Write a protein that binds this ligand. Structure first.
Ligand code: HZ0
Ligand code: GTP
Ligand code: GTP
Ligand code: CA
Ligand code: MG
Ligand code: MG
Lengths: 67, 440, 421
């Protein structure tokens, strides 16, 4: 009976720690995944704007190459 | 001991916090500067009101509360309001940019920049507790902060405080006072994320509160001030057992034992009475039987639903004021033989009663009449799932076309989080359906 | 606070821009010297949104004045509230585009743009929390159409996490005899659909019809058209300028108004041109739209409406519910509660009570179809295309801009035919 009493309270601690553990990891996973996605969206946005600058350089260059 | 730390998130939570803490002060005879003449034990004490108020050596009674909002304009009013002396400047936390009605910004983009600070300030309160019982989290479903930041906080609290109890006072959205079209999205996302981390959540349907103010108080167009003053009374009734003591006083945790048959089934329906104007209450004494019978009028519920078309899993009655067990038992006996009250087969049908002889209190210049006795019924009905159903329907209409979804994806979220959350709500609706079915 | 950085480019932009500052400065109760002489504290509650507080309680508009010709610059400085603008924020070239989109976007403007960004940068760096930029310009010209869309792309590079708003004035043969305008518009729309979060479609075709048919003003001056614009711009910014709840900032507005990123072209409305039911029926009427489009030819994705003046909030709520029920077919059912109402106690100047309308209707395509019709008429002949290609442009950029606007129209049509089931 004493042995069982130990196994019960030990199971309570284990499950409690597992919940804290899984919650901590599940959160860190999301914040990491969110950081990658948002950055990749901003990164893509700038890349399309960078392509507009490159396009403008090609326009201005094309002008003087017709004179 | 057994202290309770209140956390007020977003505009709704903050402004309701003002109504609640203003109401608490009047009930405990605490002055706006924090002094409490009736309290002879200076600097500390183990009285009942100490569960919500800490004490300084200068005799100031300080709310065990934290106010958090990602923009300053709402909390700035607290910092310069009537009860500004009541709070230490560190209890009032603000950012510079709100979540813009976006769960993503409140939970990720903007929220992550202040979450560490908030948790530190909460820790400072918790370290003043000799036996912390748990947290009370006030927030809206609709807002970006109330939705996003709350769920982030609830998750972090589960890490920093393990299985320490965490209660919710959630403001269910209504079109009469809605602020955003995407509030259904924010509602589902928060409910999903917070579900595993909440032990008990009291939902407040703004439309329900809106209708009660129009109907019972004759307010043609209720403001947040009108709604909050009514809400604070229900909150006060629920927390009265923690803030006061008495012979027939039953602790909130005991009710919670009966109200939560399964972990996910932790959404009690609140019904308060009497809500009446000073004009009508004059020369009109509402007896125990009248206010108790009023708890079974769906027009008095905090959430719009029909318990008569559902099954009860629990029924608790939290009385306060001039009430004795005799009149209660008589009123209950009459109701049982006249109302559509039916329990599921796997639970007892006995009503659990608690009484706080401390009479109700009203804020100056309020619309609510001052009555000798009041009651708040906390029932666990399957009918509350109707609230989920209405929200989930509005969610599906927009998500089928992926409307406004880009605002969330742009902040880093994925469509998988939307579907994941919706499935959890579908399971929750199914759970409430399953508990109602008769046993084999 | 939450600061907005104003920018006005080109003739049209500076005209309506100046008027915009004349009206709100009167509402917030400040004189052309920059001093406050009002009566209500509500005027200064959110003054920082559009104004910088200087020494001796001097409120300076957070505005940046731009044009490729120094002519209009003297007009503002000489006109009323000319002494209130920051002198250094005046940025002027010596060129003059002459209704060529290429000069403003690639050649002339690309040289002056940097000196503008310096002013934008100096203004922005002093913001407690910059929320975004709002631009006033036309799409029929060269500078406002060309350089205006260049600045947007440039500003979005340094401030990508900020909201980009624009008050774009659409061209109409009823006002401007300029022939090449449908090019500059299409080329501008090609940009605005990609790099702006919300665009108020100010349409001269609509502004002309209103002045002519409703207000009874034959041969209407620009002063007559701008009196509508100023009244409109004052209304759609009320929620930003005074303490409120609904759409109190540029982001929250976009979140409630834009269900899809490309579909961010609103058709504003104003009333009158009374009682609460009268106002409500007028603002939803096609005659009161500042965009030449019939809302009953499509469906409303979203709607924002402001009522100003002392009135019963009960009556307003009942009427706004009444219209949605009587006209339920013109609101998409797959977006529940897509109509939001605001109320400001302080009315505008002159009117005891008014009502401003902001609608994201699929009927906006009627405007983009008008331009597209005028565009293809010129482009099929390559009419005056050599003026563009000479500046280094390509025929493709005209083709891409055309097809991109053709996609926008079809996309507005897609969600118009869409159903719940
Ligand atoms: C064949 O029949 C014609 C002939 C001409 C004009 C037109 C027509 Cl249909 N019309 C009515 C247009 O609209 C042509 C339009 O040019 C404009 O928009 C006008 C109205 N401009 C430029 C003004 O500035 C207003 C009056 S002058 S105020 C001091 C062409 C159609 O496409 C524009 C073109 C892009 C423009 C012409 C030219 O202005 N220089 C440019 O950079 O481009 C150049 O400036 C150096 C302008 C000279 C105008 C010309 C070519 C005479
Ligand atoms: N009952 C009640 N509801 C409120 C109150 N204030 C706001 N709400 C509701 O809250 C919902 C929106 O959430 P908010 O709290 O306003 O927004 P937030 O939490 O500050 O989050 P942000 O979007 O970042 O501003 C709306 O549907 C409102 O009806 C209030 O004082 N009382
Ligand atoms: N509503 C209104 N429209 C205007 C006003 N001024 C010009 N426009 C319109 O603007 C269009 C031409 O663009 P402009 O602004 O004149 O060109 P710009 O910005 O000065 O640049 P330029 O090409 O160098 O002339 C015409 O179709 C006009 O109808 C104005 O004061 N009010
Ligand atoms: Ca004490
Ligand atoms: Mg807020
Ligand atoms: Mg010009």
């Amino acid at each position: 009976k004493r042995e069982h009493e130990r196994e019960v309270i030990q199971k309570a601690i284990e499950e409690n720690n597992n919940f804290i553990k899984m919650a901590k990891e599940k959160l860190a996973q999301k914040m990491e995944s969110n950081k990658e996605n948002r950055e990749a969206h901003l990164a893509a946005m700038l890349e399309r704007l960078q392509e507009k600058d490159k396009h403008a350089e090609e326009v201005r260059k094309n002008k003087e190459l017709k004179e | 001991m057994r202290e309770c730390i209140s956390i007020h998130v977003g505009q709704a939570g903050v402004q309701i916090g003002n109504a609640c803490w203003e109401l608490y002060c009047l009930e405990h005879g605490i002055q706006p500067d924090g002094q409490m003449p009736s309290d002879k034990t200076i600097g500390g004490g183990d009285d009942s009101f100490n569960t919500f108020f800490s004490e300084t050596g200068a005799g100031k009674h300080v709310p065990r509360a934290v106010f958090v909002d990602l923009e300053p304009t709402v909390i700035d009013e607290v910092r310069t309001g009537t009860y500004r002396q009541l709070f230490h400047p560190e209890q009032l936390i603000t950012g510079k940019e709100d979540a813009a009605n976006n769960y993503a910004r409140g939970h990720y983009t903007i929220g992550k920049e202040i979450i560490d600070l908030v948790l530190d300030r909460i820790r400072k309160l918790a370290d003043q507790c000799t036996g912390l019982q748990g947290f009370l989290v006030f927030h809206s479903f609709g807002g970006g902060t109330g939705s996003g930041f709350t769920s982030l906080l609830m998750e972090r609290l589960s890490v920093d405080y393990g299985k320490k109890s965490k209660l919710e006072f959630s403001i269910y959205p209504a079109p009469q006072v809605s602020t955003a079209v995407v509030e259904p999205y924010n509602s589902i996302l928060t409910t999903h994320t917070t579900l595993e981390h909440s032990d008990c959540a009291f939902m407040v349907d703004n439309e329900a509160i809106y209708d009660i103010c129009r109907r019972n108080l004759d307010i043609e167009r209720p403001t947040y001030t009108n709604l909050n003053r009514l809400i604070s009374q229900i909150v006060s009734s629920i927390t009265a057992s923690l803030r006061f003591d008495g012979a027939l006083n039953v602790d909130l945790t005991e009710f919670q034992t009966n109200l939560v048959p399964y972990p996910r089934i932790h959404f009690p329906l609140a019904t308060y009475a009497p809500v009446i104007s000073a004009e009508k209450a004059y020369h009109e004494q509402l007896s125990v039987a009248e206010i108790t019978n009023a708890c079974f009028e769906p027009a008095n519920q905090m959430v719009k639903c029909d318990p008569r078309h559902g099954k009860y899993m629990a029924c608790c009655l939290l009385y306060r004021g001039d009430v004795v067990p005799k009149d209660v038992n008589a009123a209950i006996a009459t109701i049982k033989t006249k109302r559509s009250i039916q329990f599921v087969d796997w639970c007892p049908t006995g009503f659990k009663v608690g009484i706080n002889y401390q009479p109700p209190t009203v804020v100056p210049g309020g619309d609510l009449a001052k009555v000798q006795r009041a009651v708040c019924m906390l029932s666990n009905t399957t009918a509350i799932a109707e609230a989920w159903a209405r929200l989930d329907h509005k969610f599906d209409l927009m998500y089928a076309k992926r409307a406004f979804v880009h605002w969330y994806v742009g902040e880093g979220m994925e469509e998988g989080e939307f579907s994941e959350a919706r499935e959890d709500m579908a399971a929750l609706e199914k759970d409430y359906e399953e508990v109602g079915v008769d046993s084999v | 606070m939450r600061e907005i950085v104003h920018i006005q480019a080109g003739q049209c932009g500076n005209q309506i821009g100046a008027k915009f500052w004349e009206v709100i400065s009167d509402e917030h109760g400040i004189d052309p010297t920059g001093s406050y002489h009002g009566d209500s504290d509500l005027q200064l509650e959110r003054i920082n949104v559009y104004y910088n507080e200087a020494t001796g309680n001097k409120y300076v508009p957070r505005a940046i004045l731009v044009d490729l010709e120094p002519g209009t610059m003297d007009s503002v400085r000489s006109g009323p509230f000319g002494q209130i603008f920051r002198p250094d924020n005046f940025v002027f070239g010596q060129s003059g585009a002459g209704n060529n989109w290429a000069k403003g976007h690639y050649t002339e403007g690309a040289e002056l743009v940097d000196s503008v960004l310096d002013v934008v940068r100096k203004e922005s760096e002093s913001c407690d929390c910059l929320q975004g930029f709002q631009l006033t310009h036309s799409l029929g010209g060269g500078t406002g159409s060309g350089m205006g869309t260049l600045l947007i792309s440039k500003i979005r590079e340094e401030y990508p996490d900020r909201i980009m708003n624009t008050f774009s004035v659409m061209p109409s043969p009823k006002v401007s005899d300029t022939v090449v305008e449908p090019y500059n518009a299409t080329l501008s729309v090609h940009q605005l659909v990609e790099n702006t979060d919300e665009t108020y479609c100010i349409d001269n075709e609509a502004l002309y019809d209103i002045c002519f048919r409703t207000l009874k003003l034959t041969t209407p001056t620009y002063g007559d058209l701008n009196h509508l614009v100023s009244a409109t711009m004052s209304g759609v910014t009320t929620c930003l300028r005074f303490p409120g709840q609904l759409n109190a900032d540029l982001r929250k507005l976009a979140v409630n108004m834009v269900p899809f990123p490309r579909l961010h072209f609103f058709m504003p409305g104003f009333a009158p041109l009374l009682t609460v039911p009268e106002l409500t029926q007028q603002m939803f009427d096609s005659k009161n739209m500042m965009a030449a489009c019939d809302p009953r030819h499509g469906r409303y994705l979203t709607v924002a409406a402001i009522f100003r003046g002392r009135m019963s909030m009960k009556e307003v709520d009942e009427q706004m519910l009444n219209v949605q029920n009587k006209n339920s077919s013109y609101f998409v059912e797959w977006i529940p509660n897509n109509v939001k109402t605001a109320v400001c106690d302080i009315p505008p100047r002159g009117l005891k009570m008014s009502a401003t309308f902001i609608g994201n209707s699929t009927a906006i395509q009627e405007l983009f179809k008008r331009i597209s019709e005028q565009f293809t008429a010129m482009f099929r002949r390559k009419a005056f295309l050599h003026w563009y290609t000479g500046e280094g442009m390509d025929e493709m950029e005209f083709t891409e801009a055309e097809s991109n606007m053709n996609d926008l129209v079809s996309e507005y049509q897609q969600y118009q035919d869409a159903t719940a089931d």
